[PDB]
Design a protein around this ligand. Sequence first.
Ligand SMILES: O[C@@H]1[C@@H](O)[C@H](O[C@@H]2CO[C@@H](O[C@@H]3CO[C@@H](O[C@@H]4CO[C@@H](O)[C@H](O)[C@H]4O)[C@H](O)[C@H]3O)[C@H](O)[C@H]2O)OC[C@H]1O
Ligand SMILES: O[C@@H]1[C@@H](O)[C@H](O[C@@H]2CO[C@@H](O[C@@H]3CO[C@@H](O[C@@H]4CO[C@@H](O)[C@H](O)[C@H]4O)[C@H](O)[C@H]3O)[C@H](O)[C@H]2O)OC[C@H]1O
Ligand SMILES: O=C[C@H](O)[C@@H](O)[C@@H](CO)O[C@@H]1OC[C@@H](O)[C@H](O)[C@H]1O
Ligand SMILES: O=C[C@H](O)[C@@H](O)[C@@H](CO)O[C@@H]1OC[C@@H](O)[C@H](O)[C@H]1O
Ligand SMILES: *[C@@H]1O[C@H](CO)[C@@H](O)[C@H](O)[C@H]1NC(C)=O
Ligand SMILES: *[C@@H]1O[C@H](CO)[C@@H](O)[C@H](O)[C@H]1NC(C)=O
Ligand SMILES: [Co+2]
Lengths: 434, 434
Amino acid sequence: QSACTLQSETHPPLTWQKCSSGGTCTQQTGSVVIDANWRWTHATNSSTNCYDGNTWSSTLCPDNETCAKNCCLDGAAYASTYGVTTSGNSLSIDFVTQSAQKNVGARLYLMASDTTYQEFTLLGNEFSFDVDVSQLPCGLNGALYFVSMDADGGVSKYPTNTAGAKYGTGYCDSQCPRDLKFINGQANVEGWEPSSNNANTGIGGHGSCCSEMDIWQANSISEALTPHPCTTVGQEICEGDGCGGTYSDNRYGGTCDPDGCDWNPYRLGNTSFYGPGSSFTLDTTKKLTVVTQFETSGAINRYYVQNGVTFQQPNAELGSYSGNELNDDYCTAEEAEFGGSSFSDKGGLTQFKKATSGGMVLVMSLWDDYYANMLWLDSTYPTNETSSTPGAVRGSCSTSSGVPAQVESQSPNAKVTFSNIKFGPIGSTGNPSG
Amino acid sequence: QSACTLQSETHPPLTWQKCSSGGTCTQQTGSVVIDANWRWTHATNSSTNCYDGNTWSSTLCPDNETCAKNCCLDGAAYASTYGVTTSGNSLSIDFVTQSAQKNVGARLYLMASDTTYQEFTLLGNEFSFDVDVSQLPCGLNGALYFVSMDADGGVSKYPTNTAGAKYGTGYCDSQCPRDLKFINGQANVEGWEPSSNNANTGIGGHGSCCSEMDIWQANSISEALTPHPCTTVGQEICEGDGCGGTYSDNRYGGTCDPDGCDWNPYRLGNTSFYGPGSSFTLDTTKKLTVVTQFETSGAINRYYVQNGVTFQQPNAELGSYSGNELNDDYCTAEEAEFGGSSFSDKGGLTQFKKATSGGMVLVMSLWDDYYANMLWLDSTYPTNETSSTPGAVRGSCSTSSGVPAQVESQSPNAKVTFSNIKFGPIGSTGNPSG
Ligand SMILES: O[C@@H]1[C@@H](O)[C@H](O[C@@H]2CO[C@@H](O[C@@H]3CO[C@@H](O[C@@H]4CO[C@@H](O)[C@H](O)[C@H]4O)[C@H](O)[C@H]3O)[C@H](O)[C@H]2O)OC[C@H]1O
Ligand SMILES: O[C@@H]1[C@@H](O)[C@H](O[C@@H]2CO[C@@H](O[C@@H]3CO[C@@H](O[C@@H]4CO[C@@H](O)[C@H](O)[C@H]4O)[C@H](O)[C@H]3O)[C@H](O)[C@H]2O)OC[C@H]1O
Ligand SMILES: O=C[C@H](O)[C@@H](O)[C@@H](CO)O[C@@H]1OC[C@@H](O)[C@H](O)[C@H]1O
Ligand SMILES: O=C[C@H](O)[C@@H](O)[C@@H](CO)O[C@@H]1OC[C@@H](O)[C@H](O)[C@H]1O
Ligand SMILES: *[C@@H]1O[C@H](CO)[C@@H](O)[C@H](O)[C@H]1NC(C)=O
Ligand SMILES: *[C@@H]1O[C@H](CO)[C@@H](O)[C@H](O)[C@H]1NC(C)=O
Ligand SMILES: [Co+2]
């Protein structure tokens, strides 16, 4: 797609700290951009929609190539349309925003310039942020994560994409998502099937795969840390059910691991660690700091800070594994005890290290789940299982929770706030901000 | 040996903090005891010495058994004889103390009661302490380390030792030291050879081996972190040159690894990290905090704090290894690049994990080196090598430094102060003291 300018595009600024082994941190100035899927897509020459509700214009978009030629992405009114605001080092995303139309959530990328994404090399480094999850009930996910996207959003590879990172193009993740409207500078109208339960979305014939580091998928009830390897590290198109992932009839046929090696303290047995109020180690009614360390071995370490008190990731015992580090032994024990082979089939932490050794783009999002109602994060899943099935229970939310239309109606003012991002060598991010 | 009471034995008190995963720390009250080798050893029935200068009474001690029957260890005047003092959570050790006689340094163990050593299970935990090394020049070593000693100092196994932990019996380490005067409830007079350069010491026919975790061997110039595995984890007697270690003609014949997998940031190439004054990352003219984390994988992580600024162990590149974690890959790369097979021959970090999974006793000492002048810690070693030999240079001290008689004459008021010991689960020791 190209870019149009019937609505101006001004990325909300966001600062963050880059820290050094020598003990100082210095402020960096970036901004955030909303993903292309949230945007108005219209004809280059008029205000006629190329995509409307959950279907495409059959005349503007008779095939993927003609559609991309005929159509552009336009600018975003971040606060009034999307409920996205920033102030200094803080970003807030509202759940439901009512303007001329209803908008649900947002997916945002950190920019290095008006036209390029910021790339972070995670290996050997740590990433710290503060989060307020107090306004996130069952069924919602405020997510902070990394994906192996191109810095230009795909422009250099696919010259029919001239919109680029400035318009939030080029997304990929470990689900090989097929709900994207443009992939590789072409539309995704071929094979499009409108969602049966979502007025605004559908599933197309192609998907967009890449490595995904889920630092944070969470609400006030549950939180998870999950690496997802793929056999191709960076962004790559896939076709139909060969994509695998959430959007395909077959979840596992493809190049990415859509399950990951997840660490959810509640799932692992510590049901007292994270939740609302003072009965929990970390009280989710209050802001908390989350620090994630990517050691050169490929293992991942985690600690939290709240009210100046530090907590390592809680210890877990699973099969022969005992510890608090997300390493080969954990991931192997997890597959053995909870089931599955997707993570190992895709090369596990060894393959994942290829992603963290390269650049990844920072994503911050707020979403509800039209496929599984977020039950995999905060409930019992699948819902017929009980607590006697190892790993079935992931949080205390009812298996009836998270119906999108219900949570959108009952909790439209839900929100997440991410702030005080700091990044640098392991051991450096707790030093004074600059 | 038995215990006598011509001089009273009052262990200087020392407090330390035990911290919990839940974020609180509580004060523990212990004390310190001086190692038996520093004590007066005399006949049970009189004040006649069993050991004097560097030789034994040939009448009281004609063989190891008769000697142990005839002889006792007596009490220690900690400050006036040994220059050992405590105050709250702080312990100081002076280098040379002049009383009726000259004393050099001390080796001390943390006690749980008047009659038992405190045992620490390191695996899954971290150990934090503060240290002032400002008064330690080239050739000296203020050491804080752990060894796999019995809690009773050997009494239960060797009933002819009735003195016990109260009199600092039962030492062992990864050198299988043969300078000990009593081992396994018998003297070490059989095969005794007085040191050619030390008026107070010698080498006997038996030695005392066990696993050794050198958290801290250091002065104002250099510091090293070193695990030493043994094929028998706990205390075990050895015979003659079969002992191996520093005290034997053959260094490597035995059950322990006397070299270890050492991590010295200077040796690894960062000559700016640790030293006196503001040209160094850590300024050794000032107190610093040293934190050492024993992850369940068997790897060891390290960070430092000075003036509220945190520094991870600096990154090192050695062969194919890159990182700041002391792990299997580091130790293997170290042997490949610097030479040697002792660490791996004895089972490496896997074998070492058997020590940290069990109890170990905390040792704090101050010493000069009558065998190699501490050159292995702070100089170029061996001394014919140059900086073109990988790993030869370990600090900036001259290869002429550390002659014991010289440093004892020039720097008798050298001292080390260890303080604010805190111990608990990984991630817990930076929380408020109780
Ligand atoms: O001037 C008017 C334009 O502003 C208006 O633009 C519309 C803005 O909203 C667009 O709908 C978005 C589409 O994305 C939805 O989010 C989905 C959530 O799940 C994700 O998996 C999925 O990928 C996302 O697509 C979002 O909730 C919703 O608001 C709409 O399509 C635009 O047309 O158009 C009319 C102009 O007059
Ligand atoms: O009442 C008098 C007693 O106090 C006096 O006791 C003497 C106290 O000093 C003893 O000499 C010690 C022996 O250990 C030396 O340290 C060595 C350092 O290197 C280590 O490897 C080695 O293992 C240690 O042994 C220490 O510097 C030195 O002071 C002496 O043997 C006692 O006799 O005895 C006379 C009474 O009248
Ligand atoms: O691991 C989770 C999964 O691979 C990703 O698809 C997930 C990460 O949070 O991404 C969200 O997918 C749904 C979409 O609505 C939202 O914008 C994404 O952040
Ligand atoms: O790793 C070093 C070696 O294995 C140990 O012998 C060393 C640890 O610092 O121990 C010292 O050995 C010499 C003695 O004079 C001193 O008391 C010990 O702490
Ligand atoms: C030494 O280590 C410190 C702390 O990691 C680092 O800041 C410094 O750049 C390093 N210097 C060299 C020369 O490697
Ligand atoms: C949960 O984790 C916290 C922090 O490590 C710990 O203090 C607490 O004892 C754990 N509780 C349970 C039930 O495992
Ligand atoms: Co590790």
